[PDB]
């Protein structure tokens, strides 16, 4: 016999070395695609900075200071002069966490709170 065990056997050994070559093409494809995921996420990150660019076009946002919380979920907030804008802040943030007589982060037009500030 001695071919499928020996001649096609070493042909299969050469196929195993070809699997080593596809382990080289394999791991090159791995690390080059991880580099590709890095550039995708970084260029995607400055693309998300272009998503922030509309909030750059917002001219920034103001500084709210709540002095009194109102029970109708419409919080009076002391603003910079010609302010005192009573408003419901954003729905993802509860009202009771916002403690009165403390400074917060407020958008300049939509008047939704971001966070409590020290």
């Amino acid at each position: 016999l001695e071919e499928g065990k020996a001649g096609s056997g070493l042909r299969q050994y050469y196929l195993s070395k070809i699997e080593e070559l596809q382990l080289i093409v394999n791991d090159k494809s791995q690390n080059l695609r991880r580099l590709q995921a890095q550039r995708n996420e970084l260029n995607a990150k400055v693309r998300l900075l272009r998503e922030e660019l509309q909030l750059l076009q917002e001219q920034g946002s103001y500084v709210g200071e709540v002095v009194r919380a109102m029970d109708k979920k419409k919080v009076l907030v002391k603003v910079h002069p010609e302010g005192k804008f009573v408003v419901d802040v954003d729905k993802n943030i509860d009202i009771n966490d916002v403690t009165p007589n403390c400074r917060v982060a407020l958008r300049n037009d939509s008047y939704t709170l971001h966070k409590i500030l020290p």
Partner: protein
């Protein structure tokens, strides 16, 4: 199976082969896109702008800024600028429209 593993496997050789010039195309194109969006966010930063003053940094990469008019503004700062420019009493300069900081000025 055993001798079929050869010619069965050759198709996996070809399919892993085809990812080579593909990852070449991605690696050549997306860095060109990276300098596209890089230069495009660079040309947002224009030199005519308003100068404010810094008051406090309440968390990382987002802070408050005293405007020249005295009203305090809440701006997420731009990511390229490091923590040296988070100096509390500083001569900060935002944009006139974007109102994000390019540079602070020496007193």
């Amino acid at each position: 199976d055993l001798y079929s593993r050869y010619k069965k496997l050759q198709q996996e050789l070809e399919f892993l082969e085809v990812q080579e010039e593909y990852i070449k195309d991605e690696q050549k194109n997306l860095k060109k896109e990276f300098l596209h969006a890089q230069e495009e966010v660079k040309r947002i930063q224009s030199i005519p702008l308003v100068i404010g003053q810094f008051l406090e940094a309440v968390d990382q990469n987002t802070a408050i800024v005293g405007s020249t008019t005295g009203s305090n503004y809440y701006v997420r700062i731009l990511s390229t600028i490091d923590r040296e420019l988070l100096k509390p009493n500083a001569s900060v300069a935002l944009h006139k429209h974007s109102n994000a900081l390019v540079d602070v000025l020496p007193p």
